[PDB]
Amino acid sequence: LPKSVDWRKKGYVTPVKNQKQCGSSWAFSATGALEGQMFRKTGKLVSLSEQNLVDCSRPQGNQGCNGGFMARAFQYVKENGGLDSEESYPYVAVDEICKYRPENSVAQDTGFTVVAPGKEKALMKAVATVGPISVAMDAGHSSFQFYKSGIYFEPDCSSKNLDHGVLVVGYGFEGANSQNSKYWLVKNSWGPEWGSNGYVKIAKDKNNHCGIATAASYPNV
């Protein structure tokens, strides 16, 4: 595998978005993974509709602004036959009536692939070979809310109890040694202003920190 990967540098990632006051990180993580897969498939980067997911995926088990899961979102895209673009179905950060329009669909999936659980090595292979990957993590600490730069490492982080969906867009290391000070490049949905231009470097190969490899997946396009 490569020593480092950064899908942002290859055009697979949209600019950072902001979920605002709605517990929709699961939707942002899902559209991020679909955006990278549609880009790999067609060469066109199109921002997808998290609102489409928020308003319409209740049957698949999601709860809009009250929470959900990326796998349920990919299930909805598969069952629904499509997903609208953000331009056509804008994000408003509140639960609204489902307004899916098939004529406006710009993405599709036949289901999804799950990365072997808890395996950071399996996650690194998926990131290097597929593109950005949806992952769940434990973001429930003040150190994460206030993160600004460097490799994030929180001793109280759990690898089992997860509460926020994010997107792994790559991995790398600090310094000249490729085997130390390793990190996962993660795109968050708290706006460009949070963290490092909206991203966070999470410690890699340090016992699956914050559970990044615990429940990872990607849509099959």
Numbering used by the authors: 1 to 221
Sentences from the paper on this structure:
Addressing the elusive specificity of cysteine cathepsins, which in contrast to caspases and trypsin-like proteases lack strict specificity determining P1 pocket, calls for innovative approaches. Hence, we set out to determine the crystal structures of cathepsin complexes with representative peptides of cleaved substrates. As a working model, cathepsin V was chosen because of the resolution of diffracting crystals (up to 1.3 Å) and crystal packing with accessible active site cleft. Reactive site mutants C25A and C25S of cathepsin V were used in structural studies.
The MPD molecules were bound to the primed site region. The peptide LLKVAL was cleaved and bound to non-primed sites only when co-crystallized, whereas soaking yielded binding in the primed binding area. Of these, 26 bound to the active site in a substrate-like manner and several of them with a different binding geometry in each molecule in the asymmetric unit. Peptides from patterns I and IV bound to cathepsin V consistent with the observed protein cleavage sites, whereas the peptides from patterns II and III did not bind according to their cleavage site found in proteins.
